[PDB]
Design an enzyme around this catalytic site. Structure first.
Site, short mmCIF file in Angstrom:
data_model
loop_
_atom_site.label_atom_id
_atom_site.label_comp_id
_atom_site.label_asym_id
_atom_site.label_seq_id
_atom_site.Cartn_x
_atom_site.Cartn_y
_atom_site.Cartn_z
N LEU A 48 0.82 -1.14 -0.05
CA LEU A 48 0.02 -0.09 -0.14
C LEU A 48 0.76 1.37 -0.10
O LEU A 48 2.11 1.14 -0.03
CB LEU A 48 -0.90 -0.02 1.34
CG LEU A 48 -2.03 -1.15 1.31
CD1 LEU A 48 -2.86 -1.15 2.37
CD2 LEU A 48 -2.94 -0.96 -0.03
N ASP A 49 0.31 2.45 -0.05
CA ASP A 49 0.80 3.66 0.12
C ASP A 49 0.39 4.45 1.11
O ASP A 49 -0.57 4.17 1.90
CB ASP A 49 0.48 4.68 -1.11
CG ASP A 49 1.01 5.77 -1.17
OD1 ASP A 49 1.99 6.20 -0.39
OD2 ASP A 49 0.83 6.62 -2.17
N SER A 50 1.19 5.38 1.60
CA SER A 50 1.18 6.25 2.75
C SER A 50 -0.32 6.83 2.99
O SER A 50 -1.10 7.03 3.73
CB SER A 50 2.23 7.31 2.93
OG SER A 50 2.12 8.05 2.02
#
Ligand SMILES: CCCCCCCCCCCCCCCCCC(=O)OC[C@H](COP(=O)([O-])OCC[N+](C)(C)C)OC(=O)CCCCCCCCCCCCCCCCC
Ligand SMILES: CCCCCCCCCCCCCCCCCC(=O)OC[C@H](COP(=O)(O)OCCN)OC(=O)CCCCCCCCCCCCCCCCC
Ligand code: SF4
Ligand code: SF4
Ligand code: SF4
Lengths: 115, 145, 176, 387, 155, 85, 114
Positions: F40-42
């Site tokens: 995932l991404d921040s």
């Protein structure tokens, strides 16, 4: 009965004219319907409302002052009797009492209208 | 059946709810239908007009997914809730039932995307009290699809 | 110098405040003064019937953009581009190909009456006074198309009235 | 919670320009008002950078359209000042004349439309008749009705048509009678007065910090004028006197506008008496074009004509800020010139752009029904504010 | 034969409907002042029956005067968009009629066509009150030939 | 809804993660590291933890939120953030 | 090279503030799309929001980052209120922009050196 016929007519012509005024515009040559109407978001005109005590109080004092007014209303019949002393006494007394209510409310913070 | 803002079809169903409540579904069912949204159609025409090899080739448009039964009527009537014409010409018109023949270039053979009914249906319908988005419970007939 | 108003002493002395209770109470100033100075009604109003009557104007007035030509019409425009060069709305177009005779005129001379602000600069800049702002204001076209003028429409505008413009120019050329 | 958010309205029947407005209020009382300006913004200052001085001048006409010959005078004085030129005397006098005439216009408008907004359907009519006479003057003068320039750098051009000053005199004769008729139409009216008495007052130093310049400072203490202190032309000489008021009450500002109309009549009169018959434009052929008689038949006049139109006169580099007295108060343009034909960067100063920023404090103490009068009282044009 | 009734009634609803035609004054910019001089006594509007009143719902037709910026434009089309279905738009002034003295930069919309359809273009900057008035009259003479109903009779 | 439990908070967190469609509930374990394991991404993190407020939760500021990164850290952080056992 | 940084000294606090901003948007997407009566699903709108963040993701200088954050809280500060009509909020979406061919021989096939 006569004035009741006048009320039947005067209610007709109201109804008739209203009906004509609804027919003819949607009886018109071409009626076209597109645009959306957004009830939608609260700030269009104004927003919400925090209904304020001032106006309501104006309705109230309109009541109390009505009551005193109609209680005063029969006077033109009563201004002629065989007791004049009492008449003047309690007519001046009564509407003087109205003016006492008003004077009180005008002394307290009521009205003053900038708030 | 072409579907859009000012159109004569789904708007008609929205306005037929009035007194007597007998638009159709006299015998019930028996009606399969796939309305198509308008911009898909007009884009169909513009690609047909500016794309070669669209000449001399007859074909039709299709509502991509829906392919609804009369459950449409109660759907479009459900969403948007609730507030000179003609005879069996008109009601037999709207009661005509078929998707007809599969083999004819459908849509992508003209190279344009298709739109399911839902969102555009919300857009054109509007009405109701407007204050709650809610859900609206999509019909999802897709009988035998 | 400063001459200031509303700095005055309202007299709370008697005979002033008499007329103050009379003034607040009886509305004399309001009634007399205002109602009467409206009862000034009877003066003949100033209104003019525009189809049948027209307001005053001036020989320097600025109408629509007629081209002019010499006696024995030469298309007085030389093509020299000035009227286009000083146009503050930039709206003009000039393309000039030397014609059969070897003299130079314009092929396409255009105006957007939309863009045109009706300066008068193109009337000052023309060395030969080819283009002059007309006397006539005659307008109200039904399409945004019709407000764009060819060299041709400007010519025909010039032919429709000249001795008009000849009278104006002959009047005011001493001022310019 | 309480409060509200209300909004503007598109027009009153006379509306000059449209604002939006957002006023967070209490019950029929405005606690916070935040005018949204920039609604009508045509981006002039970016345009002027692309057009030569002679070309950009109508912008300085119509940025503030009501008062016009004044703005003309502002930009022209700027180019002259920066360009080291003086106009001939008769040019200065004509410029003064139409300056105070224009001031008569913008004042009579501001007052009348301030009435029509508030009520009082008629005075708008009575006086704008006379205003139509005023434009009847302009049409003779400049050859058009309203926006026609008739002002240049290095002096005005195309002097008055023969027989104009007679008409000027004739209007100026009885204008006094008619404006006095307005003074009976108002001023002791219990309605208009009792509507605007103490609404939207201002403290003098406060007005200074908020930068109000105009009938504001006039009517509220702090005696000041540019006309008197920094005379920018022969407008120095003629005698007259400015009004003031001590109540800072927005009623004083009204009466000050009136008395400035009357004084404007004085200045117009004396101007008609003093007019020298010198000439129109300066005599320097490279600043201003020659008249056609010299244009033709003479070579250098022709050249300076042709180039002075194509390229336009070149202005030496420098940064100037000129300020005049315009009927809405102090008006000015800040010119920035690369040594060139075109200008570079010039930001006008709109008095309405200052005065408008003051509604926050001025309207803090009165409910919206008189926020109407609060906006309308300080002369403002949303065509000038935005720019 | 009822077509006589058709044409006559056409001249009735048309005759009246044009004879009044009281619009709303949108009045963006310096054309608005000139419009008010059309409302002044000299050039007065009222003689022709045009009434001065402000509200988009009461509005018979609309006069777009002044310069139309990008920021104002949507609001303009809304004001157009709640209106009696029969309606007409008169573009006043060089600005609104195709961009006028600006036509450039950014914020200004070029023409009021790009927003709403338009009927009478009256040029001028500002158009002399007489010219504007001539525009309204010519709009009336567009109302004469509407012949709107007998094509509802489809003949 | 008594005083909350390990099993409770765990079923809730794992539950809301499973309702979240962008992540593939192929292998999702309490020891998993998001950008490592689930990639995932921040940004995705921030949105997730936002859902951790809107359902259950409600208390989260940013400086605490950035360092969670694993569902057991959500477990313990909400746990000690509310009730000891 | 000197500088006067704005709200943050290092990219750390920058990343912090942009996280804050994205929280705000992800809060108020539903309230707006319901508020102006848009036809977009909340999911879609949110996706366009995070897209608009991702477009600028390559920036480094925290001055620039902080300034962009000022832009964001400014526009969001306008949408949280009604100051912006249905128009512009839709104008983020491009419906009326014709699809632009991004493939070469289609571009060459038409645009003649775009
Ligand atoms: C204002 C309009 C006047 C129109 C013309 C009428 C003229 C007379 C008007 C009344 C006099 C007003 C004087 C100002 C002070 C009034 C204060 C007041 O009335 O308070 C209520 C007073 C209170 O009196 P108090 O002793 O509590 O002291 C005043 C206290 N304040 C003002 C705070 C209320 O109540 C009464 O007077 C008791 C009931 C009286 C019932 C009626 C008696 C009528 C006379 C019979 C003989
Ligand atoms: C000898 C035996 C005993 C005899 C006793 C006799 C005693 C007589 C004493 C005088 C009698 C009363 C005279 C009339 C009084 C009417 C009410 C009044 O005085 O109103 C004044 C009032 C003042 O306004 P303001 O100053 O704002 O309020 C003070 C509040 N602190 O409000 C105003 O001034 C504003 C009102 C403005 C109304 C709008 C404008 C109206 C214009 C037309 C008015 C005239 C119409 C005439 C009638 C037409 C035909 C019927
Ligand atoms: S009057 Fe019109 S054509 Fe002439 S210079 Fe001005 S804008 Fe250009
Ligand atoms: S200035 Fe005169 S001669 Fe020169 S191009 Fe223009 S109209 Fe023609
Ligand atoms: S056309 Fe001229 S007068 Fe009218 S709004 Fe534009 S600049 Fe003003």
């Amino acid at each position: 009965m006569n004035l009741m016929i006048t009320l039947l007519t005067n209610f007709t012509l109201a109804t008739l004219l209203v009906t004509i005024a609804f027919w003819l515009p949607q009886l018109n040559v071409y009626s076209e319907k597109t645009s959306p109407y957004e009830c939608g978001f609260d700030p269009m005109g104004s927003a919400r409302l925090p209904f304020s005590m001032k106006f309501f109080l104006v309705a109230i004092t309109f009541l109390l002052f009505d009551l005193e007014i109609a209680l005063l209303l029969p006077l033109p019949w009563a201004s002629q009797t065989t007791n004049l002393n009492t008449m003047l006494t309690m007519a001046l007394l009564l509407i003087f009492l109205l003016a006492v209510s008003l004077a009180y409310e005008w002394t307290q913070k009521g009205l003053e209208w900038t708030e | 059946d072409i579907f859009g803002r000012e159109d004569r079809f789904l708007n008609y169903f929205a306005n037929i709810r009035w007194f007597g409540g007998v638009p159709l579904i006299s015998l019930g069912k028996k009606t399969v239908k796939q309305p198509v949204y308008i911009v898909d159609v007009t884009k169909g025409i513009i690609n047909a007009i500016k794309d070669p090899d669209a000449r001399g080739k007859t074909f039709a448009f299709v509502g991509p997914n829906r392919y609804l039964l009369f459950d449409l009527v109660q759907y479009v009537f459900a969403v948007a809730h609730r507030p000179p014409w003609t005879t069996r010409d008109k009601v037999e018109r709207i009661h005509t039932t078929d998707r007809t023949l599969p083999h004819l270039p459908g849509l992508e053979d003209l190279g344009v995307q298709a739109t399911p009914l839902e969102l555009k249906a919300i857009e054109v319908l509007r009405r109701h009290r407007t204050y709650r988005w809610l859900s609206s419970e999509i019909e999802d007939v897709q009988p035998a699809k | 110098t400063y001459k200031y108003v509303n700095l005055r002493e309202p007299s709370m002395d008697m005979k002033s405040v008499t007329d103050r209770a009379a003034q607040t109470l009886l509305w004399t100033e309001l009634i007399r003064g205002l109602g009467m100075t409206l009862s000034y009604l009877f003066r003949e109003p100033a209104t003019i019937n525009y189809p049948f009557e027209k307001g005053p104007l001036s020989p320097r007035f600025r109408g629509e953009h007629a081209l002019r030509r010499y006696p024995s019409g030469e298309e007085r425009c030389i093509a020299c581009k000035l009227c286009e060069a000083v146009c503050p709305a930039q709206a003009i177009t000039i393309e000039a190909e030397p014609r059969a005779d070897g003299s130079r005129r314009t092929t396409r001379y255009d105006i957007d009456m939309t863009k045109c602000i009706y300066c008068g600069f193109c009337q000052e800049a023309c060395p030969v006074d080819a283009i002059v702002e007309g006397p006539n204001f005659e307008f109200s076209t039904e399409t945004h198309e019709e407000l764009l003028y060819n060299k041709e429409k400007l010519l025909n505008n010039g032919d429709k009235w000249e001795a008009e413009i000849a009278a104006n120019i002959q009047a005011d050329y001493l001022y310019r | 919670v309480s409060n509200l958010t209300l909004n503007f309205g598109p027009q009153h029947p006379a509306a000059h320009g449209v604002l939006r407005l957002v006023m967070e209020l209490s019950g029929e009382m405005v606690r916070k008002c935040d005018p949204h300006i920039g609604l009508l913004h045509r981006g002039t200052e970016k345009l002027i950078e692309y057009k030569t001085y002679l070309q950009a001048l109508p912008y300085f006409d119509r940025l503030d359209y009501v008062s016009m010959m004044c703005n003309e005078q502002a930009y022209s004085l700027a180019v002259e000042k920066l360009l080291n030129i003086q106009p001939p005397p008769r040019a200065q006098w004509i410029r003064v004349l139409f300056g105070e005439i224009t001031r008569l216009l913008n004042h009579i408008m501001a007052v009348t439309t301030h009435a029509l907004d508030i009520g009082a359907m008629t005075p708008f009519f009575w006086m704008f008749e006379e205003r139509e006479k005023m434009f009847e003057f302009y049409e003779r003068v400049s050859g058009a009705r309203m926006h026609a320039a008739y002002v240049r750098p290095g002096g005005v051009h195309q002097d008055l048509p023969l027989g104009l000053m007679d008409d000027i005199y004739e209007f100026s004769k009885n204008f006094s009678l008619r404006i006095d008729e307005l003074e009976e139409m108002l001023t002791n009216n219990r309605i208009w007065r009792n509507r605007t008495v103490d609404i939207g007052v201002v403290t003098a130093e406060d007005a200074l910090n908020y930068g109000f310049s105009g009938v504001m400072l006039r009517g509220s203490g702090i005696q000041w004028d540019l006309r008197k202190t920094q005379p920018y032309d022969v407008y120095d000489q003629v005698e007259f006197d400015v009004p003031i008021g001590s109540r800072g009450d927005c009623y004083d500002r009204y009466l000050c506008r009136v008395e400035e109309m009357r004084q404007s009549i004085r200045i117009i009169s004396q101007c008609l008496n003093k007019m020298p018959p010198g000439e129109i434009k300066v005599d320097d052929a490279k600043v201003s074009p020659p008249k056609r008689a010299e244009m033709k038949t003479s070579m250098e006049s022709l050249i300076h004509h042709f180039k002075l139109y194509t390229e336009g006169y070149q202005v030496p580099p420098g940064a100037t800020y000129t300020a005049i007295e315009a009927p809405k108060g102090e008006f000015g343009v800040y010119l920035v010139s690369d040594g060139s034909s075109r200008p570079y960067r010039c930001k006008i100063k709109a008095p309405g752009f200052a005065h408008l920023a003051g509604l926050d404090k001025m309207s803090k103490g009165h409910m919206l029904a008189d926020v109407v009068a609060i906006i309308g009282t300080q002369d403002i044009v949303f065509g000038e504010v935005d720019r | 034969r009822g077509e006589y009734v058709v044409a006559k009634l056409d001249d009735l609803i048309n005759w009246a409907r044009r004879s009044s035609l009281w619009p709303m004054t949108f009045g963006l910019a310096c054309c608005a002042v000139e419009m008010m001089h059309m409302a002044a006594p000299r050039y007065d509007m009222d003689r022709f029956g045009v009434v001065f009143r402000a509200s988009p719902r009461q509005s018979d037709v609309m006069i777009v005067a002044g310069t139309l910026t990008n920021k104002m434009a949507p609001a303009l089309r809304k004001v157009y968009d709640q209106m009696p279905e029969p309606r007409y738009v008169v573009s006043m002034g060089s600005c609104a009629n195709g961009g006028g003295y600006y036509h450039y930069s950014y914020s200004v919309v070029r023409g009021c066509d790009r927003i709403v359809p338009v009927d009478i273009y009256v040029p001028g900057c500002p158009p002399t009150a007489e010219a504007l008035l001539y525009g309204i009259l010519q709009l009336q003479k567009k109302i004469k030939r509407e012949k709107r109903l007998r094509i509802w009779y489809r003949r | 809804a008594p005083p909350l439990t390990l099993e409770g908070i765990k079923d809730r967190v794992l539950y809301v993660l499973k309702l979240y469609d962008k992540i593939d509930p192929e292998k999702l374990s309490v020891n998993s590291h998001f950008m490592k394991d689930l990639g995932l991404d921040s940004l995705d993190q921030v949105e997730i933890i936002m859902a951790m407020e809107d359902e259950f939760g409600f208390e989260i500021p940013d400086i605490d939120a950035e360092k969670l990164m694993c569902p057991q850290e959500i477990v313990d952080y909400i746990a000690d953030k509310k009730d000891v056992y | 090279t000197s500088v006067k940084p704005i709200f943050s000294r290092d990219m750390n606090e920058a990343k912090r503030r942009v996280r804050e901003l994205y929280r705000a948007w992800y809060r108020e997407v539903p309230n707006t799309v319901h508020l102006f009566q848009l036809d977009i699903s909340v999911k879609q709108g949110r996706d366009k929001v995070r897209e608009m963040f991702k477009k600028n993701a390559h920036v480094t200088d925290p001055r620039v980052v902080d300034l962009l954050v000022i832009k964001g809280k400014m526009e969001l500060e306008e949408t949280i209120n009604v100051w912006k009509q249905r128009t512009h909020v839709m104008r983020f979406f491009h419906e009326t922009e014709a699809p632009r061919p991004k493939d070469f021989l289609s571009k060459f096939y038409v645009g003649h050196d775009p």
